[PDB]
Symmetry: D4
Subunit: 235 residues, 8 copies
Amino acid sequence: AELLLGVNIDHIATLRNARGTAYPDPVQAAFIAEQAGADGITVHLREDRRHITDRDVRILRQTLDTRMNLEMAVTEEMLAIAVETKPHFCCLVPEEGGLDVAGQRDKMRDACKRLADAGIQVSLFIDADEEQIKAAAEVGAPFIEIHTGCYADAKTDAEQAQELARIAKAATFAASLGLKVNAGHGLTYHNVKAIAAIPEMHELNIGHAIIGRAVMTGLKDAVAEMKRLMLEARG
Amino acid sequence: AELLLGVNIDHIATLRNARGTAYPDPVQAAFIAEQAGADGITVHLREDRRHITDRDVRILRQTLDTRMNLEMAVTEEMLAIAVETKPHFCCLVPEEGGLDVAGQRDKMRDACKRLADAGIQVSLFIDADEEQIKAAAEVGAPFIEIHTGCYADAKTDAEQAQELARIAKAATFAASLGLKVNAGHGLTYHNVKAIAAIPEMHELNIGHAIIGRAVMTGLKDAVAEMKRLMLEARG
Amino acid sequence: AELLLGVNIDHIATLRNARGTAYPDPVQAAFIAEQAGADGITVHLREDRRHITDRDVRILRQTLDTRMNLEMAVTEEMLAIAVETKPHFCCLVPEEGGLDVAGQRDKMRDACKRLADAGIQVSLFIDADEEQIKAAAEVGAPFIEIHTGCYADAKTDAEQAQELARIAKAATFAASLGLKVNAGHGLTYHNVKAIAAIPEMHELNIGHAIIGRAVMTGLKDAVAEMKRLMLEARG
Amino acid sequence: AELLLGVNIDHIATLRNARGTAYPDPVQAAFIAEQAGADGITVHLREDRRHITDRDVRILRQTLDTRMNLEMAVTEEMLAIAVETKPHFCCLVPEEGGLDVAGQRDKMRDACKRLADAGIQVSLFIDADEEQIKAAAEVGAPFIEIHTGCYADAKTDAEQAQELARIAKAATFAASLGLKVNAGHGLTYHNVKAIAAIPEMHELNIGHAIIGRAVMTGLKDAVAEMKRLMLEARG
Amino acid sequence: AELLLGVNIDHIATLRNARGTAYPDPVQAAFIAEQAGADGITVHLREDRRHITDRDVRILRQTLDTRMNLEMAVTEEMLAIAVETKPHFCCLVPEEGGLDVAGQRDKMRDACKRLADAGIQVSLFIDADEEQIKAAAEVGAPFIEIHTGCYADAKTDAEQAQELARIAKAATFAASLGLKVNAGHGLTYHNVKAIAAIPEMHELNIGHAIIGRAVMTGLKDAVAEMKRLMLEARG
Amino acid sequence: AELLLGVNIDHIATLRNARGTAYPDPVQAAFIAEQAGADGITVHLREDRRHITDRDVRILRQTLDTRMNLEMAVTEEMLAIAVETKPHFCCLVPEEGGLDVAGQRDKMRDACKRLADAGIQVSLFIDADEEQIKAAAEVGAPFIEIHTGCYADAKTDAEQAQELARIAKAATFAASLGLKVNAGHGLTYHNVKAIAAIPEMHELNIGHAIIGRAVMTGLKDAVAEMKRLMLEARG
Amino acid sequence: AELLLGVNIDHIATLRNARGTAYPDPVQAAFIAEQAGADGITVHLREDRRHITDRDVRILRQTLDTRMNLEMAVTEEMLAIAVETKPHFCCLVPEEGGLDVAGQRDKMRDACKRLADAGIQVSLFIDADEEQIKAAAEVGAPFIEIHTGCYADAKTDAEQAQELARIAKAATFAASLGLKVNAGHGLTYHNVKAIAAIPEMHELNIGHAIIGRAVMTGLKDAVAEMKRLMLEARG
Amino acid sequence: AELLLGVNIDHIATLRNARGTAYPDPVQAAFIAEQAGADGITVHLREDRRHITDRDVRILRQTLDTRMNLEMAVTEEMLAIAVETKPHFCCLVPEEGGLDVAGQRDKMRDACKRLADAGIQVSLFIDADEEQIKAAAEVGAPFIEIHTGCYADAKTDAEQAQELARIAKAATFAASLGLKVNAGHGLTYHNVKAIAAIPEMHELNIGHAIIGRAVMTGLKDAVAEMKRLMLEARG
Ligand SMILES: [O][C][C]([C]OP([O])([O])=O)O1O[C]1[C]([O])[C]OP([O])([O])=O
Ligand SMILES: [O][C][C]([C]OP([O])([O])=O)O1O[C]1[C]([O])[C]OP([O])([O])=O
Ligand SMILES: O=P(O)(O)OC[C@H](O)CO
Ligand SMILES: O=P(O)(O)OC[C@H](O)CO
Ligand SMILES: O=P(O)(O)OC[C@H](O)CO
Ligand SMILES: O=P(O)(O)OC[C@H](O)CO
Ligand SMILES: O=P(O)(O)OC[C@H](O)CO
Ligand SMILES: O=P(O)(O)OC[C@H](O)CO
């Protein structure tokens, strides 16, 4: 099918949480994004409940029209929450910045096993690294989300093209191991296309850039604009 | 009789500083607000730098088309900066929430004279309390800014009409002492009008609610809506 | 203060329940309306749960930024739900169509006390009849909502003028007894002005006409349009 | 040629009949839809006249700029009305939900001939079943509309993929028999693409999802959005 | 109440009739105007059916949400059509340009009598002339519509102020005879206010200027703009 | 391979000339169209002056930012004007609807040479008939403009695919004789694509439908929509 | 009565002339301004034809829907042009910054008389100086336009209050001598209200600020916004 | 890969500098352009500081989200500024119209090397002339920018085809020498596609036409439109 867009609305909550008022509400942003180009909504439940809260998660789970992508660390608390929330997806992240799967195979194998028993499709957030990618496939996870952070932070064009190739190459290798592959982190309006051009990419999860544009332009257009650039890249 | 709107763009920066990238940029937010109903732009330069930064204040001072209202604590560092920056207005704030002017008549006295000698119109952020208002007049400040936080937080409709009355008496009282009076903090699209209808009010400084509405509808309509409400209330 | 607009979103649910699907969602509609001129949101929980469901009320109670006006019949079931929900307002209606308070003073008296003990401000939905009005005051309700239905179905400009005059006198009589007075049912973009011009009116509750304009122009402009016509009438 | 979009406005009427009032009017909705991406308008005249009424069909027949697709059951009443109305298209449906043509070849054969003699191009609403499809061709209908309902209610990505594949094969089988093939029922902004990508599809008939998006964003953008997603899938 | 706006949509049909196609359709324009500021819709059935047709009139009569104002000459054919159409209003015009009432008293008396028997409220289109105005009241018509043509065509400011005074003065005199008074003809975006400022004016019927703006801007805004200028003039 | 759009603003003038005032002004309509997708502006200067006038042509010639396509009959008056005006293009039209070039090979021969000596690119408006096409090539005209009226008026879907094919063969035929080919007259938002997909087509001249859509949505979106459809068809 | 807005479009030409191209065309800008709040259009025909040119004036004189206000220096060349051009208004300006009328009583006396015989209403651009105003009344000019530049360039809020007062006194003074008074030049979104609130003001002529806003928001909104601010001030 | 759009905002400053005010501010225009399709921003720092100034450059260098392309003449002053400024790109221009690189091989060779040590990518603005291109490759510049002015100013369609071809051949030629090639200057909405379709093109730098469109439609749409046209050309 076509490249999917998962909108991370965490930053809506970081705006809210800077004051303890109820606005802006992530429940509203999710309706907007879902109707402006988002194919899924991503939330990251942090232990410190810095932005997204259990309240958001519980309501979002009842209001989303598409599917929730629960981002969380691999800890007993979160696994239990994930198990009871039954989100359609679960992206496991760290408590170059990606999860260390190669070095924690048993831990990761049990988490994937456990989340899948609860009928959740698991995605492991890792670096564009073949060792981590091979390990991901071996612990049994169906998805991986390639960290696009270093590509985004590239300081020169050389650094960027090098990072792009590492990512594209990583995606091809992962697909060959039968993994389905996503990307996200640091993606912006001016750097998303080269990543969206990568054929193996299944869905891009984008947050900060979108919210940063929304304050100026409104969430609806901010999301539609991102989706448009993404589909353009594939055309 | 013409109520002015001062938009506080602090939270544009909080959203940016949650990531370390350059966006969203407060300088862009100011251009938008100034052209959608804002008569002034307010930025609070906190010691910790959390949201608004020195760079922000430096560029803003050269990009604003209206005038700057520097929110700061009364310290030597800040007073130093203010005199260097020469913002049109300076609003003294602590770091019931309002400044304790009566309990520091000399520090405030010198603070005002100093900023006043720099060509800065000083405003003392205080509570709707006559003792403080008398202090501010005695101390020489041209302006005071009545804290509307307790009115915004009033749980019941009764506790609210209660705080409204206190703010209304405090504004008429301030005006009788020759003080020009502003109000800010906690004002929302839903509680602003009652405050705007208060005759003595010179300018309402508003930030969080506007930014909060902005991520949904975009800063321009968010600012324009607030100004429209304010003028309707006066009419 | 400003004439308020309460938006009834029951018909968003009507459109939803015709299919079993989850869209359109009353929770979304409420966010839009509250940010486009609505000062309150109104839902009618019907015993047959035709449109608004227990889920809607449960989620809405957690997502509304303003306040809820729960429309319900006077039955043990509903009263129990109201007490548990703690809506800000409760509008009691029948299961010309107004409540027969004068003929059930005991029942209504117990209902008002009970809800009032739960912190709920009660409104009695009644016809423009001074007997019913006098009784509503006597039973202890702080509010009443005059039934504007007959005025809306006026088949002749004359029947209309006559119905208007009757609401207006009723409103004035209501206010003299100390009641805050609302009005709603059948109000449209073409007949709202004459009712909004009535000074004693506190809040108009409008549903159908707005949703009917929304399927064409979208909810936001539909609510804003209505608020604007309402404030023009007061001006 | 271009994949066409037929917009079903039944639910505009649903919202209307909940009150006895005349708004919203299906006649207006049709003009908006035809000018925003709709290539045809679809109404279902139900024997109970739940939503669309004889008036609507009568006026619509005179105001549509494109062509009407009259959805009706195969009864003497409806057939008589169809013949008198001379709609461009007629979609026969039941009073998984598709018509049992294979089991009523005589009835359907007479129905098709009769309507065809009236100049009406007939479409048989059927399940993605080759027996029914084979029979539709044999009874003489120039069109069929595959029931996309089961595909829409797919509870698992798997049930969905399986339902899709089944529609696709059915479509290809339909085309080989010389049938023009349409599809509709339950299509949404999130599942329309996979169906629009099916080459043999001539026109998709979509109702509810569009009206559901309309109460939020207004009909025009709701229809345009849908057409756009449809042409992107073909591209 | 407030100054009403009657939108004449004749020119929509003159655009249509220049080609014999069905677009643009007056039925659509009427829905738009009615929802953008129009309080009534005006159509002029000319004997030659130059623009508006009997078809338009018959449909419009079933689709208008507000009220039809049938403009027509005082001839047996039209009276019969008026009698069967039962529009809410009927403006009698000539087959300085206004109807000659003073010189055809019997004719006019019978037409008013006849139309009123059919329950139609009659308006006579006349010059800002006291003789014609007195005659209008005497033949029994409830409304008069003052020809604003000469005010519109004024070639100098003197000519315009003179025409304005003749109109204002005419309106005061008519009101004193108990007539309700409208105006229209030649009203534009730059000359409507001075006419809308006249207190006696009940409704302004405007056509050409609105349609002329619509081609550039869209009917909706063209109507909302006119209504806004009109209410501004009265404020 | 890049299809151009030529907007005919004739009907802007017909709307104006229905009143004798200056609005709507064709000169404004041209500025809008040229900036919303039009690559050229067409005006037909009729002997009777009905819509477009000499003033129009004179100012348009100085205001157009693209180029003029003067539609005219082959007469001495018109040919005289054309040579004086020096429009970029000249489209010869009579006053099946197309020019009879074969039956006037000499008049047309001289007409072309004359206009061609003035620096005018000549186009002969003709029917999708090979005899005429051969005549136009023989006569020296650089362009021909295939009449799409019969295709636009085709009642049945069959009579339509019939006319499409004739136009498609006539365009490929024209191209083989070295003629550049345009098409115009009757094209609407709903029949344009099939015509735009024809490879040989250089520019489609379109007027009435655009103006007709313009009174509803405004000229800018009306022109932009048409261009968008045209390019989608080519893609 | 109505405070009028004259839009000066010189800077559209300024932008054009910076490249020798034809765009942007002042003629287009005038259509936009006249339909967005401008009651008049002003162009300054400088002797050096820096921005506005003779074709601009010539064409504009034929396309303006309202009326032209010709700014020009007093020289025979200009008087001949003005006289031949017959603009509705003429504002004599020097080529503080005001026209030295006192110092050239003879020249202006002849200018005013000469322009008046031509039916041109004359306005003298002067400083808020009694000497110049007496002089302007003595010479016979019907209007004066007070130079608000000093008010616009006022640094401090005091320096500015002095300037406002000076303009208001001068306005009152001018009126007492039978002069009608306009203002403008340097007026902006943030400083226009204080001037519009001056009751003697008949029309404010504004250019630069509007054009500067237009490059960001587009001319239509920039003009509507200015007109809105002005009307707000007088109400 | 992706064809890029560099927006030249010099004319924003041109409009500003025409009045000594601070608006419109180039800094605001850059934020708008970068969020509407611009991949870069170009400013020409003229030795006479006619439009863009040193503060503009200084602030822009701190606010641009993408990257700056500094246009400048080759002089020590400029080289020092460029070097100290560290813009991502530098386009050396003369102060046909192209830079005479052949005639000054020494000067440019030092310029290129000097700018490159500073980490600045250098582009030489030249005519589509092989001599100059060879010269540009010999001196070591990594980019060239072909002057499209002659193509833009091409009167006849022939004169224009010659120019296009010349640019395309020069583009192909330049590429064969290892040069990357940009184009721009004089590019407009109506002539940009033919240039964007040239495969060797890396970035088109456009200014004037966009700003000229912006005064009418606002910058955002003017930029988005240009980017859209460009991508359309390459697809
Ligand atoms: O999901 C995905 C996302 C993306 O984002 P961006 O940045 O790219 O947009 O992500 O993950 C992440 C999150 O978690 C972040 O959060 P914070 O908020 O913490 O930063
Ligand atoms: O009704 C009213 C109207 C008005 O118009 P205006 O112009 O003002 O707009 O009217 O009456 C008349 C009509 O009839 C006219 O028509 P036509 O079309 O014929 O011209
Ligand atoms: O509106 P607030 O609550 O965000 O804060 C206002 C600022 O403190 C400015 O004074
Ligand atoms: O406006 P209505 O007729 O839909 O109904 C209003 C509700 O009954 C009040 O909430
Ligand atoms: O899209 P639906 O589910 O509302 O229904 C489609 C209609 O049945 C077809 O016209
Ligand atoms: O599109 P039409 O039917 O209005 O006419 C097109 C014009 O005749 C231009 O060639
Ligand atoms: O508003 P300004 O400063 O651009 O100039 C206005 C013109 O002088 C017109 O009066
Ligand atoms: O598009 P232009 O003609 O305004 O100029 C473009 C600049 O020279 C930037 O390259």
